[PDB]
Amino acid sequence: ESTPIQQLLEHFLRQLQRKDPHGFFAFPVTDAIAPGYSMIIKHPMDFGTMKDKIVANEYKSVTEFKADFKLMCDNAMTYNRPDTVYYKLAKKILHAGFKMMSKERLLALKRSM
Ligand SMILES: CC(=O)c1cc(-c2cc(C(=O)NC3CC3)ccc2C)c2ncccn12
């Protein structure tokens, strides 16, 4: 049993995860691999958490999903230095997400529904 919003959100999530083939954004960051992480990042987010929220139907809208996506990227851009693979990849993901879930993109989608 799934719903149209769940299917749409699963599509966006799958498209974004394709940009992170190594799964750096797939699971929560621990302090053991990222020293100090929990002291600097107060609201952690990752793709796996987002997938669980989709499954539990916790997102009422694409706006709420976008907010978690944005948090995940902002966290990575705040914690990691600009030279790192994690920072760079966060910028890539974020740009892809802005393109995919922009207001004009969502308008065109609404037109077709
Ligand atoms: C998003 C973020 O800030 C982040 C993600 C990771 C991460 C890395 C690996 C890994 O396999 N790394 C080896 C290739 C070098 C696995 C799982 C995670 C969560 C990470 N590690 C250190 C500092 C920041 N991060």
PDB file of C-alpha atoms and ligand atoms in Angstrom, residues 20 22-30 32-35 37 41 45-46 72-73 75-77 79-80 84-87 89-90, ligand 1:
ATOM      1  CA  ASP A  20      26.154   9.774  -4.120  1.00  0.00           C
ATOM      2  CA  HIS A  22      29.455   5.650  -2.419  1.00  0.00           C
ATOM      3  CA  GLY A  23      26.761   6.190   0.179  1.00  0.00           C
ATOM      4  CA  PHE A  24      28.451   9.025   2.093  1.00  0.00           C
ATOM      5  CA  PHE A  25      25.001  10.530   2.588  1.00  0.00           C
ATOM      6  CA  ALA A  26      23.133   7.241   3.039  1.00  0.00           C
ATOM      7  CA  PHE A  27      23.594   6.786   6.839  1.00  0.00           C
ATOM      8  CA  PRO A  28      24.052   9.065   9.961  1.00  0.00           C
ATOM      9  CA  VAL A  29      27.528  10.558  10.419  1.00  0.00           C
ATOM     10  CA  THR A  30      29.112   9.338  13.715  1.00  0.00           C
ATOM     11  CA  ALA A  32      33.964   8.298  15.427  1.00  0.00           C
ATOM     12  CA  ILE A  33      34.477   9.080  11.663  1.00  0.00           C
ATOM     13  CA  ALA A  34      33.889  12.845  11.961  1.00  0.00           C
ATOM     14  CA  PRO A  35      35.454  14.243  15.195  1.00  0.00           C
ATOM     15  CA  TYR A  37      30.329  16.209  14.562  1.00  0.00           C
ATOM     16  CA  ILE A  41      25.706  19.733  13.877  1.00  0.00           C
ATOM     17  CA  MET A  45      19.941  14.262   8.505  1.00  0.00           C
ATOM     18  CA  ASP A  46      20.816  11.586   5.877  1.00  0.00           C
ATOM     19  CA  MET A  72      21.478  17.390   5.036  1.00  0.00           C
ATOM     20  CA  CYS A  73      23.429  19.479   2.527  1.00  0.00           C
ATOM     21  CA  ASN A  75      25.139  20.253   7.580  1.00  0.00           C
ATOM     22  CA  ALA A  76      27.769  18.831   5.281  1.00  0.00           C
ATOM     23  CA  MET A  77      28.692  22.337   4.051  1.00  0.00           C
ATOM     24  CA  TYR A  79      30.933  20.752   9.185  1.00  0.00           C
ATOM     25  CA  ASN A  80      33.367  19.799   6.368  1.00  0.00           C
ATOM     26  CA  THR A  84      36.887  17.811   1.234  1.00  0.00           C
ATOM     27  CA  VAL A  85      35.020  15.332  -0.882  1.00  0.00           C
ATOM     28  CA  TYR A  86      32.062  15.592   1.487  1.00  0.00           C
ATOM     29  CA  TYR A  87      31.739  19.372   1.061  1.00  0.00           C
ATOM     30  CA  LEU A  89      29.606  16.376  -3.015  1.00  0.00           C
ATOM     31  CA  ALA A  90      27.089  18.247  -0.826  1.00  0.00           C
TER      32      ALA A  90
HETATM   33  C1  LIG B   1      28.148  13.685   5.013  1.00  0.00           C
HETATM   34  C2  LIG B   1      29.448  13.791   5.813  1.00  0.00           C
HETATM   35  O1  LIG B   1      29.734  14.886   6.393  1.00  0.00           O
HETATM   36  C3  LIG B   1      30.210  12.617   5.943  1.00  0.00           C
HETATM   37  C4  LIG B   1      29.916  11.356   5.524  1.00  0.00           C
HETATM   38  C5  LIG B   1      30.944  10.518   5.863  1.00  0.00           C
HETATM   39  C6  LIG B   1      30.994   9.128   5.628  1.00  0.00           C
HETATM   40  C7  LIG B   1      32.127   8.618   4.989  1.00  0.00           C
HETATM   41  C8  LIG B   1      32.243   7.245   4.670  1.00  0.00           C
HETATM   42  C9  LIG B   1      33.378   6.659   4.041  1.00  0.00           C
HETATM   43  O2  LIG B   1      33.235   5.557   3.509  1.00  0.00           O
HETATM   44  N1  LIG B   1      34.506   7.371   3.856  1.00  0.00           N
HETATM   45  C10 LIG B   1      35.704   6.789   3.200  1.00  0.00           C
HETATM   46  C11 LIG B   1      35.997   7.054   1.788  1.00  0.00           C
HETATM   47  C12 LIG B   1      36.721   7.712   2.830  1.00  0.00           C
HETATM   48  C13 LIG B   1      31.150   6.416   5.011  1.00  0.00           C
HETATM   49  C14 LIG B   1      29.999   6.907   5.656  1.00  0.00           C
HETATM   50  C15 LIG B   1      29.951   8.251   5.976  1.00  0.00           C
HETATM   51  C16 LIG B   1      28.814   8.713   6.673  1.00  0.00           C
HETATM   52  C17 LIG B   1      31.886  11.256   6.427  1.00  0.00           C
HETATM   53  N2  LIG B   1      33.098  10.957   6.958  1.00  0.00           N
HETATM   54  C18 LIG B   1      33.883  11.885   7.509  1.00  0.00           C
HETATM   55  C19 LIG B   1      33.517  13.272   7.621  1.00  0.00           C
HETATM   56  C20 LIG B   1      32.281  13.540   7.074  1.00  0.00           C
HETATM   57  N3  LIG B   1      31.457  12.533   6.526  1.00  0.00           N
END
